[PDB]
Design a binder for this molecule. Structure first.
Ligand SMILES: CN1C(=O)[C@H]2CCC[C@H]2N(C2CCCC2)c2nc(Nc3ccc(C(N)=O)cc3)ncc21
Length: 342
C-alpha cells in the first residue's frame, strides 16, 4: 500500500515534490538526476543563501552503507583540499531526512558529455582540451597524495562537470565507485569504454587505471567520439589492440584472463582469438587525431593552436597515458611537466 508512510515508491526512492521545504532550510526546485544510488535534486539553501545539489540516497541498507563510504572519502579529501584548488567536488554537509541520507554538494554546470552533445559529437578544441587535461592531471595528482591514495575508479565525461557554464573550470564528481588503494577486492570495475587493460586482463591495479581513463577521455573531448567504444570486453580489447597493438608478452604471461582475448602459440607469442578489426596497431592515433590533416574530420584546419607541432605534443602525452604497462604509465606529476602544457 505505502512505503515509508507514503514518502517512498516501490524503488525505495523519495517522491520528490516541487516547492517542498525540508527542515526550514532547503527549498526543493526539481529533479536534476537519477541513478542506482537514488536521486539528485536542485534546491536553494536558505541559510547559506545559494543553490546546491542534493543527492538523496534510497531508503535501503545497501545504498546507505555504500553512501557513507562515499561520505568518508569526500570529507577526507575536503580536509586536504580546504581552499578547493584541486578540482574535486565539494561535499558541504550531509543529513538524514525521513530515513533518506541526503548529501549536499555544490551546484555545478553542464557535464563534458553535454558539451560533446552540443557539438553533435564532433568535439571541442585542443585549447579547451588542454585546459581540461591540465585540471584532470592536477586532480589526479591530488588523488595520488599518499594519505589519500584514492582511485576514482569510474572516470568518464559525464562524471566531469564545469563549475560555471561560461568558464573552463571543472570539478570531478561521483565517488560512489571510488576506493582507496589496497588489496584487490573488486575486478569488474570502471565504465567499459574507459576500462584499463589490466582490469580487462584480471591483473593487479592501482592509481594508474584513472590515467588510462583520462587518456581515453581527452581524445574523446577532441574527436567527439569515444576512442574505444566496446560493446563487450572482447570488442573493448580488440578496439584497444587496433590502436596500440598486441599487449607485451611479459604482461600477457602474468594475466589470468589473457585467454579471453588472446591465444598463446607453441613458440610463446600471443595473437588475437578470432571472434572485422584492423590489424594490431594500424588504426594509428596520429590518423585518429589528424595531426597533419587539420584535426578530426579536417575541421580544425587553419585554427590557431592546431598545428602539426601542437598535435604531436598532445599525441605524445596520450600515448604515455595509454601505456599498456601501469608501472611505467605516466603519472600526474610528470604529465603536468609535459611539452603539451607549455
Ligand atoms: C544541474 N546539473 C545538471 O544539469 C547536470 C550537469 C551534468 C550532470 C547533472 N548533475 C547531476 C546528475 C546526477 C549527478 C550529477 C548536476 N550535478 C551537480 N552537482 C553534483 C555534483 C556531484 C554529485 C555527486 N554525485 O557527487 C552530485 C551532484 N550540479 C548540477 C547538476
Amino acid at each position: 500500500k505505502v512505503y515509508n508512510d507514503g514518502y517512498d515508491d516501490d524503488n525505495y526512492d523519495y517522491i520528490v515534490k516541487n516547492g517542498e521545504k525540508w527542515m526550514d532550510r532547503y527549498e526543493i526546485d526539481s529533479l536534476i538526476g537519477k541513478g542506482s544510488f537514488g536521486q539528485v535534486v536542485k534546491a536553494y539553501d536558505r541559510v547559506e543563501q545559494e543553490w546546491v545539489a542534493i543527492k538523496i540516497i534510497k531508503n535501503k541498507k545497501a545504498f546507505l552503507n555504500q553512501a557513507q563510504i562515499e561520505v568518508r572519502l569526500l570529507e577526507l579529501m575536503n580536509k586536504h583540499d580546504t581552499e578547493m584548488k584541486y578540482y574535486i567536488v565539494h561535499l558541504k554537509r550531509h543529513f538524514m531526512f525521513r530515513n533518506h541520507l541526503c548529501l549536499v554538494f555544490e551546484m555545478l554546470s553542464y557535464n563534458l558529455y553535454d558539451l560533446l552533445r552540443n557539438t553533435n559529437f564532433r568535439g571541442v578544441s585542443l585549447n579547451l582540451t588542454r585546459k581540461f587535461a591540465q585540471q584532470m592531471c592536477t586532480a589526479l595528482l591530488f588523488l595520488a597524495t599518499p594519505e589519500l591514495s584514492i582511485i576514482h575508479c569510474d572516470l568518464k565525461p559525464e562524471n566531469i562537470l564545469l563549475c560555471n557554464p561560461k568558464r573552463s573550470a571543472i570539478k570531478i564528481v561521483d565517488f560512489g565507485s571510488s576506493c582507496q588503494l589496497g588489496q584487490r577486492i573488486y575486478q569488474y570495475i570502471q565504465s567499459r569504454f574507459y576500462r584499463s587493460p589490466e582490469v580487462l586482463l584480471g591483473m593487479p591495479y592501482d592509481l594508474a587505471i584513472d590515467m588510462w581513463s583520462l587518456g581515453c577521455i581527452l581524445v574523446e573531448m577532441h574527436t567527439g567520439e569515444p576512442l574505444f567504444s566496446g560493446a563487450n570486453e572482447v570488442d573493448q580489447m580488440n578496439k584497444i589492440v587496433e590502436v596500440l597493438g598486441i599487449p607485451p608478452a611479459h604482461i600477457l604471461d602474468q594475466a589470468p584472463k589473457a585467454r579471453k582475448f588472446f591465444e598463446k602459440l607453441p613458440d610463446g607469442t600471443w595473437n588475437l582469438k578470432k571472434t572485422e578489426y584492423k590489424p594490431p596497431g594500424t588504426r594509428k592515433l596520429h590518423n585518429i587525431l589528424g595531426v597533419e590533416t587539420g584535426g578530426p574530420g579536417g575541421r580544425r584546419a587553419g585554427e590557431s593552436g592546431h598545428t602539426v607541432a601542437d598535435y604531436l605534443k598532445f599525441k605524445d602525452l596520450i600515448l604515455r597515458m595509454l601505456d599498456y604497462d601501469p608501472k611505467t604509465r605516466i603519472q600526474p606529476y610528470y604529465a603536468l611537466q609535459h611539452s603539451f602544457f607549455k
